Amino acid sequence: LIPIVVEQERAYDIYSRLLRERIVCVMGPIDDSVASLVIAQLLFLQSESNKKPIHMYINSPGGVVTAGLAIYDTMQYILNPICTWCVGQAASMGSLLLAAGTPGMRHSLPNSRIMIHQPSAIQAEEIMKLKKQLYNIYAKHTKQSLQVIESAMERDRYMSPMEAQEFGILDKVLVHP
Amino acid sequence: LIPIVVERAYDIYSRLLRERIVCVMGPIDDSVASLVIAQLLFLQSESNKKPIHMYINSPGGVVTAGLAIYDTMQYILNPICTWCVGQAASMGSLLLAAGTPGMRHSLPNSRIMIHQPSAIQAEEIMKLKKQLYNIYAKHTKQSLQVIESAMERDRYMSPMEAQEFGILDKVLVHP
Amino acid sequence: LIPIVVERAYDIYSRLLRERIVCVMGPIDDSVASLVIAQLLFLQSESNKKPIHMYINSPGGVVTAGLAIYDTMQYILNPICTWCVGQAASMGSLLLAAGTPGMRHSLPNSRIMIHQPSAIQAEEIMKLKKQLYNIYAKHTKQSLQVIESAMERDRYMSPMEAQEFGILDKVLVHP
Amino acid sequence: LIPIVVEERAYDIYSRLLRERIVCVMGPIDDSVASLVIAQLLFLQSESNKKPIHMYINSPGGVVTAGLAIYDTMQYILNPICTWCVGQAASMGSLLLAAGTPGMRHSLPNSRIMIHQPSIAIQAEEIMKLKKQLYNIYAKHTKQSLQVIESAMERDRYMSPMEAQEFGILDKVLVH
Amino acid sequence: LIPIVVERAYDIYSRLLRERIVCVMGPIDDSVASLVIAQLLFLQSESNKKPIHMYINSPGGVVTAGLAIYDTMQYILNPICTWCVGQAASMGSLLLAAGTPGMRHSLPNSRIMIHQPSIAIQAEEIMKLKKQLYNIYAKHTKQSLQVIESAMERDRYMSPMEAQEFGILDKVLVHP
Amino acid sequence: LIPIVVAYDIYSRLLRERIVCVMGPIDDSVASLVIAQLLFLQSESNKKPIHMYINSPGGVVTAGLAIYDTMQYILNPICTWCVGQAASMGSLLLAAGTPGMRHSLPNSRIMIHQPSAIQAEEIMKLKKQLYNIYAKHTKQSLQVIESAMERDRYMSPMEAQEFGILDKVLVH
Amino acid sequence: LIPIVVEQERAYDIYSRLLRERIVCVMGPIDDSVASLVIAQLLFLQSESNKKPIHMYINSPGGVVTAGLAIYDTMQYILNPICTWCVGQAASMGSLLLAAGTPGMRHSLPNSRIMIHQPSAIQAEEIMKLKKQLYNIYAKHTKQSLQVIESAMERDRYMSPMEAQEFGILDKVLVH
Amino acid sequence: LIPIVVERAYDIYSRLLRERIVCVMGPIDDSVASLVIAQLLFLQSESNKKPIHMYINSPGGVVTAGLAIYDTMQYILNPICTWCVGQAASMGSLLLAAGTPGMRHSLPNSRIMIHQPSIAIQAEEIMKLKKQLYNIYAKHTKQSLQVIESAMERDRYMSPMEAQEFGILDKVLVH
Amino acid sequence: LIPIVVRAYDIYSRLLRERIVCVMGPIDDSVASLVIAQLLFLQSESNKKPIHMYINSPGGVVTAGLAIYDTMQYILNPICTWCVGQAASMGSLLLAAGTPGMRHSLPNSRIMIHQPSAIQAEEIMKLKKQLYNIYAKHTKQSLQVIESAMERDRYMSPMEAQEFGILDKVLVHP
Ligand SMILES: O=c1c2c(c3cccnc3n1Cc1ccc(Cl)cc1)CCN(Cc1cccc(Cl)c1)C2
Ligand SMILES: O=c1c2c(c3cccnc3n1Cc1ccc(Cl)cc1)CCN(Cc1cccc(Cl)c1)C2
Ligand SMILES: O=c1c2c(c3cccnc3n1Cc1ccc(Cl)cc1)CCN(Cc1cccc(Cl)c1)C2
Ligand SMILES: O=c1c2c(c3cccnc3n1Cc1ccc(Cl)cc1)CCN(Cc1cccc(Cl)c1)C2
Ligand SMILES: O=c1c2c(c3cccnc3n1Cc1ccc(Cl)cc1)CCN(Cc1cccc(Cl)c1)C2
Ligand SMILES: O=c1c2c(c3cccnc3n1Cc1ccc(Cl)cc1)CCN(Cc1cccc(Cl)c1)C2
Ligand SMILES: O=c1c2c(c3cccnc3n1Cc1ccc(Cl)cc1)CCN(Cc1cccc(Cl)c1)C2
Ligand SMILES: O=c1c2c(c3cccnc3n1Cc1ccc(Cl)cc1)CCN(Cc1cccc(Cl)c1)C2
Ligand SMILES: O=c1c2c(c3cccnc3n1Cc1ccc(Cl)cc1)CCN(Cc1cccc(Cl)c1)C2
């Protein structure tokens, strides 16, 4: 099961303990219920303090686009600087959350792989309206012109942490503290 | 269910966590990696100098998840003790070999496989595999060629054989 | 089920085989490969000089099965007209471009793709995809670097753009 | 469900058995139960590496590497281990039963014993390496020869407790 | 779900356990056999002199699981009051007849069946267990083997009194 | 889910008021739970009555007879209430109610007809265990019981008061 | 939907027409039902003429080992020369059949994939006795050492047609 | 997917039945038993002295179905040639042993097992069918019952020659 | 896959032309339907030449068995019943229902009259009686012996079933 930690007294499950340290780990497929559970924690965490930084752990293959955007809007709304940390793969919407971190504060561990390409019910016009919301969100953050974003996304390939740094998805590739 | 142990009583798994022992039993997925990573970071915060103990009995699993555990192992300042019971195959043998040098152990009758099991673009399968070549070459001190070649053989190593290859350091029958 | 036409009677696909027309509709696998190869060798028996017309409306499929069809087209002496109707994808575009030079066709609203959709080791998926690079380059006249870079793009092509690349030769609305 | 006994702390009856240094191995052996038994043994040695630990075996066998991991742990810890076969001990379970401390392997009257093996994915060479690993373990504790140990495990049959005692798998057939 | 009683709060089933009552109800498998053995050994530790009460409403179960419970019943020193309510069939009716002599009860409308239902085993091995049940039945019912073998050959249930005349139980009680 | 009252689960409450709910299909698991409840309320007092709420469409014949003989064994008076349909075994546990204390609500449905692995002879010996049981509690002859149980038919609470299956019908 | 061909009037399906040219397209996964049709077709083709060549088309991923040995033995039994043709792929028991053709008559098309690696309910001793049967057969036909065959088959990899020729599995690599 | 042959047109299996060959391939059950028995009786009425051939490639099956075939083989007057291809285990090996003496064959790589593997029936009934198999085996292998029991107790396969030594067949067709 | 023989019929259609009906498998309403159709047809060709019935069955639906049994007694043809493999439940009743002197079995068959373990109890009990009678009539055993033999959960050897009265000849070859 989920292991329990004790400190002096109260007993915590391990994911509640991380939240106490101001850490929100987006480590699964992104869907409406994960968005609900992240947004609640982010909002709770600035309620503690609008200035003290908040940490996100991103090991995700992507997911539902509106759910990732619900998370994205929340990150931008809240005042805290947000550190994005990519430990597993950062793919589809997961990469969008990684690049949306506070500039200069977006990290990745050395062996992660990042992919901005989106995998393959709504109309064509609506699918295509959402794809361009990503473009612009990516161009806003990745700091790549809209066109090269498009070119990079149509390429079904992964990036290395060094590649993603050159591309502007993330800011620092560390191995040790 | 899970038994409890005692004054306070804790389930036996959380008890191992109180002893800085991190169980990595069963197949590795994103669910297991995230849970392992959380405990590793928790235990480092209690002490960046007391050793960490990983028990490994795993048939392998997702590469990115196993790599996520690998990178956390390297990141934390703590010396990490990998212990192998039963088996360590595919990503399992990589986590074991990524223990702190001189502190990677196997019980006598365990089995070790670094050969990977038989969706994404063909070039991505090759890039991830080649990241395994470098990681194994770093920690077994072998060469990339050797690593590749040995990974091409569908077979298991005895603890003795895996000690000569560089995956582990001690085959402890007794304390 | 399948309608019957008179000439003695014959189901409507066997009638196309009488007109030297072979149908590759739908996904490719080993069974389809055995059907397609048998008809191709059979039609060569009737005459190794008169052309064989091969219709393609396929999203691709097993790559080794598709290669079994490609080798058989190249093997037989008969010139082979390829006709893409509806759309072409994965192995579909390979067989389309593999037709005899000058006899590669497509209808206006066709929809062609050389990108490959996402249990064997990592290295043999590489050599397989690299075999396709060379087959594509030989028929499209492009450099391996142009082929390799193009196959990375997840997109379909128009019949006119597929002709510009060298996949097919004529975009026919009516003869 | 599981009953609760209260001593004031309240325990599930299995934890209460674990209280008395009793580890239950009832049912098939897979990776999850190997972990749960190993943790119990490792913990019970932490309590005391001198007091004996009692191990209850009613198992039809299971995954081999899971059994080898419980066996390897049994030999690692310093406590003497008393194995008790109730019901049945077949395939890997009988190896855990035979792996008790000499003079401390017991079975109940109606306790069936079987060393024959039932007939992820592995090469052929790897299944034969594991079979011979069991050939050596059984011979070490039963004191029989490899020749005897291979021939016996070739037979699809069960042993009575006394036939197992005569064989070297257990040491005491107790009625009371 | 399971109701709770208060005295401290207990689920009803754990309340029956402090009264020294163990419930063998439902099909008998290795899990059921494991709890029953644990409660029995636990009840012996609180007092090896004071009677334990067993309640049997079982339609049978795994033979080796029933034998594991039976052996535990004989091992411990406590007298065992077995109670059949609803039905006791095959391994269920064996446990009922294996209570302490003079303390095998049944409610008026209960039913008893010693007929057996029809890891897999060899022909020679199902016959060996079939013969153990004969001897076990022959012991606690005081009939000839020849009586037992033929009685189990018939696919029928008996009345409480017919089970009394046969030797499986001692008392058919309506009221205390 | 299950509500809480002040603190106990609501079903754990009714039992403290000496009430038992036989409300669902009767099987071995229901039997044990029920029968353990009955035996525990007798530990409270062998004299304060036990009330039993019955809304069941039937179930395993041995399970119902298991509860039945338990009701007979314990001394306390037992009041049976057919709040809800009493089909088959529920209707059985009803006649079993202490003479004079078998009630029902107005729109209840009662049926003694049995619904359409054993031998062919055993089922018959069971169908006849039931014949004697209603004939004992409904005061009827075995013939009228056997003939009525052939009818795939429900009784309304007044009818079954005439039959003898219950004693009082209550609106309040 | 199997097309039909006519001769004049005799209407065959596309496969019965290939059988009539003494060509048997043994493709797809090999099991007992595949074994039978292949055994029969081969046997039937010899009854028409024990001198004219027989042709096999192999596009198979492998399959049940005993079924491939049934086909193998019949290929050897019939006096006819057998021309094996690999199109697409021939792995595990497929590649064995491809190597089992008459010396100087085992072909492959330019893009075929050939593998002798065996992929990952019988005892361990006899899964190994089968593996050694494959060693001997592979070495008899490829004219390689036993040891060379063993270690080549533990490498999980495919061969190209022109490496398979160098190894001894096939003789000729045709483009026309 | 079953081919036809001409002679004037047969599916290939009926062609084999025309050649007095009866196929027993796959698991043996009541449907196999009925079809095999009907072919045996049909072949006897065509000629009660021409030999009949059986092709055995079976892992075994239901015991009563196999016995129904065994008794029919013994009933009919024809000599019966048994040919083992692939494997002959459990009831498969009994039908193979129950051929006319001197007419029991096997191919080189075949495998043979008499060990019985592990309507539902009582204990006394399995041993009844089991002892009944012992006596049929001794009957045709000329072995003693004591040899038969202990041999069938071992979970293993025989080579074609080790089975010939034991009395199951008479001949191995070596190339 | 059913073979065809030589004017070309499948192996099973061939075995009807030879006045033979084979109940090889479990008995249900569909089997009874197909069996009874054959029996009435075989009587159409002639109701004097024998009809040969092959039985390798573990039983099945009782009414379907009784439907076949009644048709057997109705048609005038003498019916040779043959048990190969086994005959249990309704299978043994169809076997014992053969014409006196013409009920056979091969040496290694097993025969069972025990009935293995929706309707009411009265109705199932009532068909048991029915089987009780049919068994007593053809084995010529008394009802008392019949019902005691079917509470027993066991099979008979062909020779044992001959002295019980379920068959007449245990033969190895003609
Ligand atoms: O941020 C808020 C917000 C609201 C609020 C209202 C009352 C008390 N506080 C509140 N706080 C602070 C807080 C306290 C406690 C916790 Cl636990 C968490 C957060 C209302 C508006 N809402 C807007 C919003 C922002 C982003 C995403 C969504 Cl979907 C919605 C923000
Ligand atoms: O280690 C950290 C980290 C961060 C952090 C942030 C705020 C407060 N503390 C933090 N601590 C200490 C801590 C105390 C208590 C607990 Cl319970 C857990 C951790 C953020 C950076 N991150 C880096 C990292 C390394 C390896 C794997 C991953 Cl995925 C991530 C480590
Ligand atoms: O083409 C052939 C071939 C062969 C052949 C052998 C004997 C008689 N004819 C034969 N013919 C002519 C034919 C007549 C009639 C029909 Cl119906 C079909 C074909 C053997 C070799 N093989 C090579 C081959 C090429 C491409 C793919 C594969 Cl898998 C195999 C081609
Ligand atoms: O025995 C140990 C061990 C280790 C350990 C580390 C830190 C704290 N304590 C530890 N103890 C004592 C302990 C107390 C309490 C509990 Cl609950 C569990 C264990 C590490 C090494 N390991 C080796 C081992 C042997 C057999 C099987 C396995 Cl898989 C592993 C033994
Ligand atoms: O009975 C025992 C036993 C043992 C034991 C060892 C140490 C401490 N106590 C122990 N007790 C008393 C106890 C206290 C508390 C509880 Cl909760 C349960 C039991 C060891 C031997 N074993 C034998 C046995 C008998 C019957 C069935 C089986 Cl499978 C096994 C009985
Ligand atoms: O009634 C009993 C009974 C027994 C008993 C034994 C020890 C302590 N008390 C006991 N009591 C009183 C009690 C106290 C406490 C509780 Cl919580 C519940 C009940 C044993 C016999 N049994 C007979 C019985 C009757 C009906 C159905 C069944 Cl299956 C069994 C009744
Ligand atoms: O080859 C045979 C064989 C037999 C045979 C018997 C009677 C008539 N003919 C026969 N022929 C010629 C034939 C005619 C027609 C057809 Cl369609 C096919 C073949 C009997 C022996 N058997 C041996 C055998 C070899 C390889 C595999 C197996 Cl499993 C079995 C070969
Ligand atoms: O062998 C027989 C038999 C019978 C028969 C009756 C009428 C016409 N012929 C008959 N023949 C020859 C035949 C020709 C043609 C065909 Cl297609 C099939 C068979 C009746 C008796 N029976 C006995 C038997 C033996 C072995 C197994 C069983 Cl289950 C049954 C054999
Ligand atoms: O026997 C009959 C019967 C009827 C019949 C009617 C018209 C033409 N013929 C008929 N025959 C001879 C026939 C020839 C050929 C064939 Cl294929 C089938 C039957 C009608 C009555 N029926 C009674 C019956 C007996 C047994 C079982 C059942 Cl369910 C029904 C018998």
From Swiss-Prot, chain B:
Q: Kindly report, in one word, the top-level EC class recorded for this enzyme.
A: hydrolase
State which Enzyme Commission number(s) the record gives: 3.4.21.92
What are the N6-acetyllysine sites (modified residues) in this protein?
138
Q: Which family does it belong to?
A: Belongs to the peptidase S14 family.
Query: What does the UniProt record say this protein does?
Result: Protease component of the ClpXP complex that cleaves peptides and various proteins in an ATP-dependent process. Has low peptidase activity in the absence of CLPX. The ClpXP complex can degrade CSN1S1, CSN2 and CSN3, as well as synthetic peptides (in vitro) and may be responsible for a fairly general and central housekeeping function rather than for the degradation of specific substrates. Cleaves PINK1 in the mitochondrion.
Kindly state the subunit structure of this protein.
Fourteen CLPP subunits assemble into 2 heptameric rings which stack back to back to give a disk-like structure with a central cavity. Component of the ClpXP complex formed by the assembly of two CLPP heptameric rings with two CLPX hexameric rings, giving rise to a symmetrical structure with two central CLPP rings flanked by a CLPX ring at either end of the complex.
Provide the protein name.
ATP-dependent Clp protease proteolytic subunit, mitochondrial
What organism is recorded for this protein?
Answer: Homo sapiens (Human)
Question: What is the organism lineage in this UniProt record?
Answer: Eukaryota, Metazoa, Chordata, Craniata, Vertebrata
Q: Intact protein stretch covered?
A: 58 to 248 of 277
UniProtKB/Swiss-Prot annotation, chain C:
Q: Localized where?
A: Mitochondrion matrix
Task: Kindly identify the residues recorded as the active site.
Answer: 90 (nucleophile), 115
Q: Which UniProt keywords apply?
A: Acetylation, Deafness, Disease variant, Hydrolase, Mitochondrion, Protease, Serine protease, Transit peptide
| Any one biological process term the GO annotation gives | protein quality control for misfolded or incompletely synthesized proteins
Q: Which EC number(s) does UniProt give? A: 3.4.21.92
Name positions with the PTM N6-acetyllysine.
138
GO cellular component terms, alphabetically, are: endopeptidase Clp complex; mitochondrial matrix; mitochondrion
Q: What is its main location?
A: mitochondrion
What are the N6-succinyllysine sites (modified residues) in this protein? 127
Which GO molecular function entries does the Swiss-Prot or TrEMBL record give?
A: ATP-dependent peptidase activity; ATPase binding; endopeptidase activity; identical protein binding; peptidase activity; serine-type endopeptidase activity
Q: How the protein is affected by changing residue 90 to A/C?
A: Abolishes protease activity
Describe the reaction catalysed, as an equation.
Hydrolysis of proteins to small peptides in the presence of ATP and magnesium. alpha-casein is the usual test substrate. In the absence of ATP, only oligopeptides shorter than five residues are hydrolyzed (such as succinyl-Leu-Tyr-|-NHMec, and Leu-Tyr-Leu-|-Tyr-Trp, in which cleavage of the -Tyr-|-Leu- and -Tyr-|-Trp bonds also occurs)
In what tissue types does this protein appear?
A: Detected in liver (at protein level). Predominantly expressed in skeletal muscle. Intermediate levels in heart, liver and pancreas. Low in brain, placenta, lung and kidney.
Would the keyword Mitochondrion turn up in this protein's UniProt record? yes
Q: What is stated as this protein's family in its record?
A: Belongs to the peptidase S14 family.
Task: Indicate the disease this protein is implicated in.
Answer: Perrault syndrome 3: An autosomal recessive, sex-influenced disorder characterized by sensorineural deafness in both males and females, and ovarian dysgenesis in females. Affected females have primary amenorrhea, streak gonads, and infertility, whereas affected males show normal pubertal development and are fertile. A spectrum of additional clinical features, including cerebellar ataxia, learning disability, and peripheral neuropathy, have been described in some PRLTS3 affected individuals.
Mind telling me what this protein is named?
ATP-dependent Clp protease proteolytic subunit, mitochondrial
Q: Which residues of the full protein are shown?
A: 58 to 248 of 277
Curated annotation (Swiss-Prot), chain D:
Task: Name the predominant localization.
Answer: mitochondrion
Q: Which catalysed reactions does the entry list for this protein?
A: Hydrolysis of proteins to small peptides in the presence of ATP and magnesium. alpha-casein is the usual test substrate. In the absence of ATP, only oligopeptides shorter than five residues are hydrolyzed (such as succinyl-Leu-Tyr-|-NHMec, and Leu-Tyr-Leu-|-Tyr-Trp, in which cleavage of the -Tyr-|-Leu- and -Tyr-|-Trp bonds also occurs)
Q: Does the keyword Nucleus apply?
A: no
Q: Where is the active site?
A: 91 (nucleophile), 116
Q: In the record, which positions carry N6-acetyllysine?
A: 140
Q: Which GO terms describe its biological process?
A: membrane protein proteolysis; mitochondrial protein catabolic process; protein quality control for misfolded or incompletely synthesized proteins; proteolysis; proteolysis involved in protein catabolic process
Known tissue expression: Detected in liver (at protein level). Predominantly expressed in skeletal muscle. Intermediate levels in heart, liver and pancreas. Low in brain, placenta, lung and kidney.
Q: Which UniProt keywords apply?
A: Acetylation, Deafness, Disease variant, Hydrolase, Mitochondrion, Protease, Serine protease, Transit peptide
> From the Swiss-Prot or TrEMBL record, what is one GO molecular function term?
identical protein binding
Q: What class of enzyme is it?
A: hydrolase
Per the record, its GO cellular-component terms are:
endopeptidase Clp complex; mitochondrial matrix; mitochondrion
Question: Which top-rank group of organisms is this from?
Answer: Eukaryota
- Look up the EC number in the record and give it: 3.4.21.92
Q: Which residues carry this modification: N6-succinyllysine?
A: 129
Q: Where in the cell is it found?
A: Mitochondrion matrix
**Which disorder does the record name?**
Perrault syndrome 3: An autosomal recessive, sex-influenced disorder characterized by sensorineural deafness in both males and females, and ovarian dysgenesis in females. Affected females have primary amenorrhea, streak gonads, and infertility, whereas affected males show normal pubertal development and are fertile. A spectrum of additional clinical features, including cerebellar ataxia, learning disability, and peripheral neuropathy, have been described in some PRLTS3 affected individuals.
The UniProt family comment states: Belongs to the peptidase S14 family.
The molecule here is called ATP-dependent Clp protease proteolytic subunit, mitochondrial
Gene this chain is encoded by: CLPP
